[PDB]
Amino acid sequence: TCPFYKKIPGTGFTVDAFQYGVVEGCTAYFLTHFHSDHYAGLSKHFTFPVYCSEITGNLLKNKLHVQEQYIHPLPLDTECIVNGVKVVLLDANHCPGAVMILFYLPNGTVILHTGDFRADPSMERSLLADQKVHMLYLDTTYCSPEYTFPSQQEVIRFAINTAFEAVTLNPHALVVCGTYSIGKEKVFLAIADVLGSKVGMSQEKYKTLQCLNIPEINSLITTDMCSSLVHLLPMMQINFKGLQSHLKKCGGKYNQILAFRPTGWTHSNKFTRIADVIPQTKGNISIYGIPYSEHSSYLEMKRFVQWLKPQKIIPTVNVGTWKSRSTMEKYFREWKLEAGY
Ligand code: NI
């Protein structure tokens, strides 16, 4: 049955709640972003209204075959009215099409659901600046102080410099990047741009990327693996057996693979700067795990909440153990005492 933290009090709304069948008293189902833990349960047979971004709606139509008449895309940064309640969709700095949702309840309560997000100071100048928030449904994925990671920009610098150096030393090397859902596209697109190549991939993944509006995408991506020296593969195939096999498939066009696995976090971060990261190597295959996160670090999350000053925080991640829940609640108290709200 539907958890309380997916239900918006005083409305008929739910958020990311499609795996529970027909939710009692739900008149409209919101979807924050196109990741499988959030959309689990949508299909061509769904006949309730779905509210989402333009990008997420392109993905619903094209990949899951949801019928057009049930998809209700909304523009960002725009006040809209849904079943008589004012709503606003805000950029979540997660994956393409990911949003936060602001709900303005008929009684005066204002609710922010972050969906999945990576908090950033740019958010402190959207429609959030203009009013108070009573309840915050918060993406608490990395809500512990051990989770520090670099900026996205520093990580992309590291990847571009590493790939450019490797291919300049050996023009017969291949670069591979792992993927398992939309998000983290900058990794592979920035590498391709510096090498003057397109990114080669499966027709299924190419279709997925064409759903996203990204400007100049016919320019960066392709299904012709032959013409490409950056290849995208399923994350599961990013290991020595998987990559030896792929290399066999390229018919002696290449003699070396350099592969990247963008991960959320790895405990190497507790003891290492980005500048200091090294690969795992076996034969002519090297694998780099890079800390490219699309979720807030602990410090970024803390800053967001101390700026917003919500009256109540409802975590949406790590809620399944008493120890995790208690840990998070202790941090929320610290943050409030330290900021004076
Ligand atoms: Ni997500």
mmCIF file of C-alpha atoms and ligand atoms in Angstrom:
data_model
loop_
_atom_site.group_PDB
_atom_site.id
_atom_site.type_symbol
_atom_site.label_atom_id
_atom_site.label_comp_id
_atom_site.label_asym_id
_atom_site.label_seq_id
_atom_site.Cartn_x
_atom_site.Cartn_y
_atom_site.Cartn_z
ATOM 1 C CA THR A 1 0.000 0.000 0.000
ATOM 2 C CA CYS A 2 1.070 3.611 -0.649
ATOM 3 C CA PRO A 3 3.460 5.129 1.920
ATOM 4 C CA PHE A 4 2.452 8.376 3.640
ATOM 5 C CA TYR A 5 5.511 10.231 2.343
ATOM 6 C CA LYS A 6 4.091 9.892 -1.311
ATOM 7 C CA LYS A 7 0.775 11.533 -0.400
ATOM 8 C CA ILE A 8 0.133 15.312 -0.418
ATOM 9 C CA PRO A 9 -2.251 16.267 2.508
ATOM 10 C CA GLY A 10 -5.389 18.232 1.620
ATOM 11 C CA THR A 11 -5.321 17.303 -2.055
ATOM 12 C CA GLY A 12 -6.208 14.335 -4.208
ATOM 13 C CA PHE A 13 -2.522 14.096 -5.261
ATOM 14 C CA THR A 14 0.239 11.537 -5.140
ATOM 15 C CA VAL A 15 3.912 11.773 -6.111
ATOM 16 C CA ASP A 16 5.870 8.975 -7.792
ATOM 17 C CA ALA A 17 3.183 6.404 -6.711
ATOM 18 C CA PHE A 18 2.472 4.162 -9.702
ATOM 19 C CA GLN A 19 3.329 0.690 -8.250
ATOM 20 C CA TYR A 20 0.392 0.483 -5.833
ATOM 21 C CA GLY A 21 -2.520 0.094 -8.279
ATOM 22 C CA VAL A 22 -5.396 2.475 -7.785
ATOM 23 C CA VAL A 23 -4.621 4.688 -4.805
ATOM 24 C CA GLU A 24 -7.683 5.514 -2.692
ATOM 25 C CA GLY A 25 -8.838 9.077 -3.310
ATOM 26 C CA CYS A 26 -6.038 9.897 -5.777
ATOM 27 C CA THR A 27 -7.434 12.077 -8.586
ATOM 28 C CA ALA A 28 -4.032 13.014 -10.171
ATOM 29 C CA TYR A 29 -0.667 11.221 -10.205
ATOM 30 C CA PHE A 30 2.507 13.383 -10.444
ATOM 31 C CA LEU A 31 5.838 11.986 -11.764
ATOM 32 C CA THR A 32 9.016 13.896 -10.813
ATOM 33 C CA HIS A 33 11.384 12.147 -13.346
ATOM 34 C CA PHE A 34 11.900 9.126 -15.604
ATOM 35 C CA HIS A 35 13.851 6.709 -13.316
ATOM 36 C CA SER A 36 12.433 3.127 -12.813
ATOM 37 C CA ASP A 37 12.083 3.330 -8.990
ATOM 38 C CA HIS A 38 9.757 6.334 -9.566
ATOM 39 C CA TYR A 39 7.788 5.327 -12.697
ATOM 40 C CA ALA A 40 7.458 1.569 -11.758
ATOM 41 C CA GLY A 41 3.932 0.625 -12.853
ATOM 42 C CA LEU A 42 3.194 3.024 -15.757
ATOM 43 C CA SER A 43 2.223 1.480 -19.205
ATOM 44 C CA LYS A 44 -0.115 1.860 -22.176
ATOM 45 C CA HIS A 45 -3.040 0.689 -19.944
ATOM 46 C CA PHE A 46 -2.791 3.549 -17.435
ATOM 47 C CA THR A 47 -5.925 5.817 -17.680
ATOM 48 C CA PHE A 48 -5.528 8.388 -14.892
ATOM 49 C CA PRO A 49 -4.100 11.856 -15.541
ATOM 50 C CA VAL A 50 -0.271 12.058 -15.188
ATOM 51 C CA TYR A 51 1.336 15.424 -14.540
ATOM 52 C CA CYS A 52 5.044 15.934 -15.378
ATOM 53 C CA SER A 53 7.636 17.958 -17.325
ATOM 54 C CA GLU A 54 7.677 18.132 -21.149
ATOM 55 C CA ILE A 55 10.765 15.830 -21.302
ATOM 56 C CA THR A 56 9.311 13.242 -18.905
ATOM 57 C CA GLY A 57 6.092 13.250 -21.016
ATOM 58 C CA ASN A 58 8.102 12.565 -24.238
ATOM 59 C CA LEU A 59 9.628 9.585 -22.499
ATOM 60 C CA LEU A 60 6.210 8.296 -21.218
ATOM 61 C CA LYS A 61 4.734 8.512 -24.775
ATOM 62 C CA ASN A 62 7.703 7.035 -26.620
ATOM 63 C CA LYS A 63 9.274 4.487 -24.236
ATOM 64 C CA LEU A 64 6.337 3.214 -22.109
ATOM 65 C CA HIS A 65 3.611 3.922 -24.755
ATOM 66 C CA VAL A 66 1.347 5.817 -22.335
ATOM 67 C CA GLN A 67 -1.466 7.346 -24.368
ATOM 68 C CA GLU A 68 -1.202 11.065 -25.180
ATOM 69 C CA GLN A 69 -4.688 11.927 -23.792
ATOM 70 C CA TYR A 70 -3.533 10.991 -20.238
ATOM 71 C CA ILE A 71 -0.194 12.900 -20.317
ATOM 72 C CA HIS A 72 -0.343 16.415 -19.024
ATOM 73 C CA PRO A 73 3.036 18.156 -19.509
ATOM 74 C CA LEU A 74 3.618 21.466 -17.677
ATOM 75 C CA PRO A 75 6.074 24.275 -18.433
ATOM 76 C CA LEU A 76 8.699 25.005 -15.799
ATOM 77 C CA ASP A 77 8.770 28.132 -13.639
ATOM 78 C CA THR A 78 5.094 28.792 -14.416
ATOM 79 C CA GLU A 79 2.057 28.970 -12.085
ATOM 80 C CA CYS A 80 -0.466 26.338 -13.262
ATOM 81 C CA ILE A 81 -3.827 25.109 -11.842
ATOM 82 C CA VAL A 82 -4.477 21.399 -11.352
ATOM 83 C CA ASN A 83 -7.886 20.246 -9.980
ATOM 84 C CA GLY A 84 -8.149 23.633 -8.443
ATOM 85 C CA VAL A 85 -4.767 23.765 -6.719
ATOM 86 C CA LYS A 86 -1.927 26.085 -7.895
ATOM 87 C CA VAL A 87 1.310 24.186 -8.688
ATOM 88 C CA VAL A 88 4.763 25.124 -9.972
ATOM 89 C CA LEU A 89 7.471 22.773 -11.480
ATOM 90 C CA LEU A 90 11.119 23.811 -10.726
ATOM 91 C CA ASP A 91 14.341 22.390 -12.166
ATOM 92 C CA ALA A 92 15.714 19.643 -9.780
ATOM 93 C CA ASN A 93 19.378 19.590 -11.183
ATOM 94 C CA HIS A 94 18.989 15.685 -11.301
ATOM 95 C CA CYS A 95 18.621 13.997 -14.741
ATOM 96 C CA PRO A 96 16.964 15.483 -17.841
ATOM 97 C CA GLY A 97 13.351 16.399 -17.218
ATOM 98 C CA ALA A 98 13.581 16.017 -13.430
ATOM 99 C CA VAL A 99 11.535 18.515 -11.389
ATOM 100 C CA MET A 100 10.693 19.631 -7.845
ATOM 101 C CA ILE A 101 6.960 20.474 -7.259
ATOM 102 C CA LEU A 102 5.590 23.400 -5.254
ATOM 103 C CA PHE A 103 1.920 22.961 -4.128
ATOM 104 C CA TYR A 104 -0.183 25.962 -2.825
ATOM 105 C CA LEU A 105 -2.973 24.403 -0.780
ATOM 106 C CA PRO A 106 -6.401 26.076 -0.628
ATOM 107 C CA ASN A 107 -5.937 26.715 3.179
ATOM 108 C CA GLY A 108 -2.595 28.647 2.782
ATOM 109 C CA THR A 109 -0.098 25.777 3.424
ATOM 110 C CA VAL A 110 2.771 25.642 0.953
ATOM 111 C CA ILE A 111 4.493 22.261 0.307
ATOM 112 C CA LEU A 112 7.790 21.579 -1.622
ATOM 113 C CA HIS A 113 8.437 17.999 -2.888
ATOM 114 C CA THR A 114 12.068 17.873 -4.122
ATOM 115 C CA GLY A 115 11.690 14.570 -5.975
ATOM 116 C CA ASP A 116 15.333 13.477 -6.574
ATOM 117 C CA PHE A 117 17.642 16.635 -6.572
ATOM 118 C CA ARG A 118 21.143 18.014 -6.278
ATOM 119 C CA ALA A 119 20.750 21.178 -4.223
ATOM 120 C CA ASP A 120 22.488 24.203 -5.672
ATOM 121 C CA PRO A 121 22.647 27.885 -4.729
ATOM 122 C CA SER A 122 21.020 28.798 -8.057
ATOM 123 C CA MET A 123 17.780 27.411 -6.586
ATOM 124 C CA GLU A 124 17.837 30.257 -3.971
ATOM 125 C CA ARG A 125 16.717 32.492 -6.900
ATOM 126 C CA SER A 126 13.692 30.746 -8.451
ATOM 127 C CA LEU A 127 10.046 31.074 -7.342
ATOM 128 C CA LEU A 128 11.253 29.609 -3.979
ATOM 129 C CA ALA A 129 12.643 32.916 -2.865
ATOM 130 C CA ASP A 130 9.153 34.575 -2.988
ATOM 131 C CA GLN A 131 7.326 32.691 -0.142
ATOM 132 C CA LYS A 132 7.489 30.526 2.899
ATOM 133 C CA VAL A 133 7.330 26.675 2.891
ATOM 134 C CA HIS A 134 5.579 24.815 5.661
ATOM 135 C CA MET A 135 6.425 21.212 4.681
ATOM 136 C CA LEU A 136 9.463 19.855 2.731
ATOM 137 C CA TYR A 137 9.494 16.334 1.310
ATOM 138 C CA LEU A 138 13.242 15.909 1.021
ATOM 139 C CA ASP A 139 15.596 13.686 -1.041
ATOM 140 C CA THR A 140 17.815 12.459 1.791
ATOM 141 C CA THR A 141 19.893 9.916 -0.298
ATOM 142 C CA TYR A 142 23.276 11.174 1.092
ATOM 143 C CA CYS A 143 22.116 12.547 4.444
ATOM 144 C CA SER A 144 25.321 11.741 6.462
ATOM 145 C CA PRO A 145 28.512 13.848 6.766
ATOM 146 C CA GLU A 146 30.766 11.213 5.220
ATOM 147 C CA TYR A 147 29.175 11.970 1.877
ATOM 148 C CA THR A 148 31.375 14.666 0.401
ATOM 149 C CA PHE A 149 31.971 14.799 -3.323
ATOM 150 C CA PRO A 150 33.468 17.214 -5.850
ATOM 151 C CA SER A 151 31.500 19.483 -8.185
ATOM 152 C CA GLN A 152 30.277 18.030 -11.433
ATOM 153 C CA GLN A 153 32.554 20.436 -13.233
ATOM 154 C CA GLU A 154 35.758 19.164 -11.496
ATOM 155 C CA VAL A 155 34.787 15.564 -12.301
ATOM 156 C CA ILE A 156 34.159 16.349 -15.993
ATOM 157 C CA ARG A 157 37.584 18.172 -16.142
ATOM 158 C CA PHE A 158 39.237 15.068 -14.826
ATOM 159 C CA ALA A 159 37.457 12.761 -17.329
ATOM 160 C CA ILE A 160 38.159 15.020 -20.431
ATOM 161 C CA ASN A 161 41.885 15.400 -19.526
ATOM 162 C CA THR A 162 42.307 11.642 -18.883
ATOM 163 C CA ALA A 163 40.542 10.535 -22.126
ATOM 164 C CA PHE A 164 42.287 13.260 -24.281
ATOM 165 C CA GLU A 165 45.721 12.211 -22.880
ATOM 166 C CA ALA A 166 45.075 8.491 -23.391
ATOM 167 C CA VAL A 167 43.853 8.756 -27.014
ATOM 168 C CA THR A 168 46.604 11.220 -27.979
ATOM 169 C CA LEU A 169 49.220 8.677 -26.703
ATOM 170 C CA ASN A 170 47.422 5.808 -28.404
ATOM 171 C CA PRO A 171 45.137 6.699 -31.349
ATOM 172 C CA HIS A 172 43.959 3.065 -31.422
ATOM 173 C CA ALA A 173 42.485 3.204 -27.882
ATOM 174 C CA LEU A 174 38.636 3.037 -27.407
ATOM 175 C CA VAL A 175 36.813 4.967 -24.674
ATOM 176 C CA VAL A 176 33.733 3.274 -23.118
ATOM 177 C CA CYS A 177 31.235 4.880 -20.742
ATOM 178 C CA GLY A 178 28.714 2.841 -18.692
ATOM 179 C CA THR A 179 25.035 3.790 -18.418
ATOM 180 C CA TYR A 180 21.857 2.364 -16.830
ATOM 181 C CA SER A 181 19.299 5.128 -16.838
ATOM 182 C CA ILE A 182 19.005 8.655 -18.244
ATOM 183 C CA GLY A 183 21.241 11.177 -16.345
ATOM 184 C CA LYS A 184 25.017 11.844 -16.372
ATOM 185 C CA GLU A 185 24.969 12.463 -20.161
ATOM 186 C CA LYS A 186 27.636 15.211 -19.751
ATOM 187 C CA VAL A 187 30.231 12.529 -18.975
ATOM 188 C CA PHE A 188 30.111 10.907 -22.376
ATOM 189 C CA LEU A 189 29.164 14.056 -24.356
ATOM 190 C CA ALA A 190 32.131 16.100 -22.969
ATOM 191 C CA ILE A 191 34.639 13.298 -23.748
ATOM 192 C CA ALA A 192 33.255 12.940 -27.312
ATOM 193 C CA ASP A 193 33.454 16.711 -27.890
ATOM 194 C CA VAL A 194 37.154 16.863 -26.844
ATOM 195 C CA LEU A 195 38.131 13.870 -29.029
ATOM 196 C CA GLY A 196 36.147 15.144 -32.055
ATOM 197 C CA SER A 197 34.058 11.955 -32.155
ATOM 198 C CA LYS A 198 30.339 11.076 -31.866
ATOM 199 C CA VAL A 199 29.081 8.736 -29.158
ATOM 200 C CA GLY A 200 28.060 5.355 -30.498
ATOM 201 C CA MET A 201 25.266 3.361 -28.880
ATOM 202 C CA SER A 202 22.368 0.905 -29.345
ATOM 203 C CA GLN A 203 19.271 2.028 -31.286
ATOM 204 C CA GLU A 204 17.260 1.741 -28.001
ATOM 205 C CA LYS A 205 19.573 4.138 -26.137
ATOM 206 C CA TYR A 206 19.708 6.522 -29.153
ATOM 207 C CA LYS A 207 15.878 6.718 -29.198
ATOM 208 C CA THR A 208 15.874 7.493 -25.438
ATOM 209 C CA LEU A 209 18.317 10.351 -25.942
ATOM 210 C CA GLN A 210 16.274 11.750 -28.889
ATOM 211 C CA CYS A 211 13.327 12.082 -26.477
ATOM 212 C CA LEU A 212 15.244 14.651 -24.363
ATOM 213 C CA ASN A 213 15.287 18.049 -26.358
ATOM 214 C CA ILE A 214 19.168 18.276 -25.880
ATOM 215 C CA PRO A 215 20.330 20.870 -28.471
ATOM 216 C CA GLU A 216 22.699 19.571 -31.086
ATOM 217 C CA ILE A 217 22.063 15.937 -30.317
ATOM 218 C CA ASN A 218 22.017 14.728 -33.920
ATOM 219 C CA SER A 219 25.480 16.414 -33.661
ATOM 220 C CA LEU A 220 26.883 14.361 -30.717
ATOM 221 C CA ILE A 221 25.304 10.859 -30.863
ATOM 222 C CA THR A 222 25.017 7.982 -33.382
ATOM 223 C CA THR A 223 24.154 4.331 -33.888
ATOM 224 C CA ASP A 224 27.153 3.764 -36.168
ATOM 225 C CA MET A 225 29.569 2.190 -33.757
ATOM 226 C CA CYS A 226 32.224 1.962 -36.555
ATOM 227 C CA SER A 227 32.618 5.647 -36.993
ATOM 228 C CA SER A 228 32.826 6.318 -33.229
ATOM 229 C CA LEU A 229 35.661 6.129 -30.644
ATOM 230 C CA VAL A 230 33.427 6.736 -27.613
ATOM 231 C CA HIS A 231 30.969 3.812 -27.019
ATOM 232 C CA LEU A 232 28.155 3.661 -24.451
ATOM 233 C CA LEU A 233 27.429 0.254 -22.906
ATOM 234 C CA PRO A 234 25.203 -1.037 -20.125
ATOM 235 C CA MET A 235 26.690 -0.405 -16.707
ATOM 236 C CA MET A 236 26.757 -4.212 -16.090
ATOM 237 C CA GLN A 237 29.166 -4.808 -18.945
ATOM 238 C CA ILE A 238 31.779 -2.354 -17.322
ATOM 239 C CA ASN A 239 34.106 -5.033 -15.929
ATOM 240 C CA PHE A 240 37.098 -6.890 -17.380
ATOM 241 C CA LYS A 241 35.177 -9.827 -18.931
ATOM 242 C CA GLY A 242 32.488 -7.593 -20.482
ATOM 243 C CA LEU A 243 35.084 -5.210 -21.922
ATOM 244 C CA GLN A 244 37.496 -7.926 -23.259
ATOM 245 C CA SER A 245 34.423 -9.224 -25.132
ATOM 246 C CA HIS A 246 33.430 -5.864 -26.555
ATOM 247 C CA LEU A 247 36.989 -5.345 -27.726
ATOM 248 C CA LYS A 248 36.839 -8.708 -29.540
ATOM 249 C CA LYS A 249 33.735 -7.402 -31.320
ATOM 250 C CA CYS A 250 35.504 -4.370 -32.827
ATOM 251 C CA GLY A 251 37.538 -6.519 -35.261
ATOM 252 C CA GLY A 252 41.037 -5.180 -34.582
ATOM 253 C CA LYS A 253 40.061 -1.538 -34.977
ATOM 254 C CA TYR A 254 41.258 -0.938 -31.380
ATOM 255 C CA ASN A 255 43.928 -2.441 -29.073
ATOM 256 C CA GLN A 256 43.170 -0.768 -25.726
ATOM 257 C CA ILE A 257 40.021 0.249 -23.719
ATOM 258 C CA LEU A 258 39.776 3.069 -21.231
ATOM 259 C CA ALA A 259 36.376 2.808 -19.436
ATOM 260 C CA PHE A 260 34.470 5.110 -17.101
ATOM 261 C CA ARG A 261 31.903 4.075 -14.447
ATOM 262 C CA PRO A 262 30.214 7.192 -13.084
ATOM 263 C CA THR A 263 29.125 6.189 -9.554
ATOM 264 C CA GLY A 264 27.237 8.196 -6.897
ATOM 265 C CA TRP A 265 29.730 7.778 -4.012
ATOM 266 C CA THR A 266 32.662 5.508 -3.168
ATOM 267 C CA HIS A 267 34.586 5.587 0.285
ATOM 268 C CA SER A 268 37.731 6.450 -1.736
ATOM 269 C CA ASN A 269 36.274 10.043 -1.403
ATOM 270 C CA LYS A 270 36.946 9.947 2.384
ATOM 271 C CA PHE A 271 40.696 9.568 1.728
ATOM 272 C CA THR A 272 41.255 10.964 -1.819
ATOM 273 C CA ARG A 273 40.920 14.187 -3.953
ATOM 274 C CA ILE A 274 39.678 13.914 -7.595
ATOM 275 C CA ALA A 275 43.205 14.742 -8.818
ATOM 276 C CA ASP A 276 44.386 11.596 -6.975
ATOM 277 C CA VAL A 277 41.985 8.951 -8.519
ATOM 278 C CA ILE A 278 43.585 5.943 -10.320
ATOM 279 C CA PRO A 279 42.130 3.106 -12.361
ATOM 280 C CA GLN A 280 41.857 -0.628 -11.990
ATOM 281 C CA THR A 281 43.924 -2.208 -14.785
ATOM 282 C CA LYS A 282 44.199 -5.713 -16.326
ATOM 283 C CA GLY A 283 46.097 -6.217 -19.548
ATOM 284 C CA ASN A 284 45.028 -3.528 -22.075
ATOM 285 C CA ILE A 285 41.853 -2.521 -20.108
ATOM 286 C CA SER A 286 41.638 0.288 -17.526
ATOM 287 C CA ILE A 287 38.443 1.160 -15.460
ATOM 288 C CA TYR A 288 38.004 4.502 -13.688
ATOM 289 C CA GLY A 289 35.235 4.906 -11.053
ATOM 290 C CA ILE A 290 34.404 8.599 -11.001
ATOM 291 C CA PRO A 291 32.232 10.364 -8.365
ATOM 292 C CA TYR A 292 29.717 12.055 -10.655
ATOM 293 C CA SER A 293 26.631 12.568 -8.419
ATOM 294 C CA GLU A 294 23.112 13.776 -9.408
ATOM 295 C CA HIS A 295 22.125 13.929 -5.700
ATOM 296 C CA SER A 296 23.013 16.495 -3.033
ATOM 297 C CA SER A 297 26.120 16.004 -0.941
ATOM 298 C CA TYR A 298 25.494 16.311 2.839
ATOM 299 C CA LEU A 299 26.812 19.892 2.901
ATOM 300 C CA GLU A 300 24.751 20.960 -0.164
ATOM 301 C CA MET A 301 21.578 19.460 1.412
ATOM 302 C CA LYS A 302 22.279 21.177 4.765
ATOM 303 C CA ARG A 303 22.767 24.600 3.041
ATOM 304 C CA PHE A 304 19.492 24.215 1.135
ATOM 305 C CA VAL A 305 17.440 23.384 4.156
ATOM 306 C CA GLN A 306 19.040 26.120 6.373
ATOM 307 C CA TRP A 307 18.191 28.688 3.585
ATOM 308 C CA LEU A 308 14.604 27.409 3.066
ATOM 309 C CA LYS A 309 13.744 27.090 6.823
ATOM 310 C CA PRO A 310 10.840 24.713 6.515
ATOM 311 C CA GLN A 311 8.548 24.117 9.494
ATOM 312 C CA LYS A 312 8.525 20.353 8.983
ATOM 313 C CA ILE A 313 10.859 17.921 7.063
ATOM 314 C CA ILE A 314 9.602 14.572 5.730
ATOM 315 C CA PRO A 315 12.463 12.379 4.366
ATOM 316 C CA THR A 316 11.769 10.339 1.237
ATOM 317 C CA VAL A 317 14.976 8.189 1.132
ATOM 318 C CA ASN A 318 16.575 5.838 3.726
ATOM 319 C CA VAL A 319 13.270 5.701 5.696
ATOM 320 C CA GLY A 320 13.161 1.914 6.045
ATOM 321 C CA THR A 321 15.357 1.414 9.201
ATOM 322 C CA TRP A 322 14.892 2.919 12.683
ATOM 323 C CA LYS A 323 18.586 3.669 12.875
ATOM 324 C CA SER A 324 18.613 5.624 9.570
ATOM 325 C CA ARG A 325 15.459 7.534 10.408
ATOM 326 C CA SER A 326 16.805 8.474 13.913
ATOM 327 C CA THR A 327 20.192 9.522 12.436
ATOM 328 C CA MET A 328 18.488 11.842 9.890
ATOM 329 C CA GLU A 329 16.170 13.400 12.555
ATOM 330 C CA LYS A 330 19.221 14.248 14.710
ATOM 331 C CA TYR A 331 20.859 16.091 11.756
ATOM 332 C CA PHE A 332 17.610 18.008 11.050
ATOM 333 C CA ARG A 333 17.579 19.222 14.708
ATOM 334 C CA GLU A 334 21.239 20.294 14.509
ATOM 335 C CA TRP A 335 20.573 22.250 11.333
ATOM 336 C CA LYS A 336 17.585 24.049 12.813
ATOM 337 C CA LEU A 337 19.462 24.947 16.081
ATOM 338 C CA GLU A 338 22.500 26.117 14.222
ATOM 339 C CA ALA A 339 20.415 28.337 11.859
ATOM 340 C CA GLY A 340 18.048 29.703 14.549
ATOM 341 C CA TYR A 341 14.641 28.820 12.979
HETATM 342 NI NI NI B 1 16.465 9.440 -9.623
#
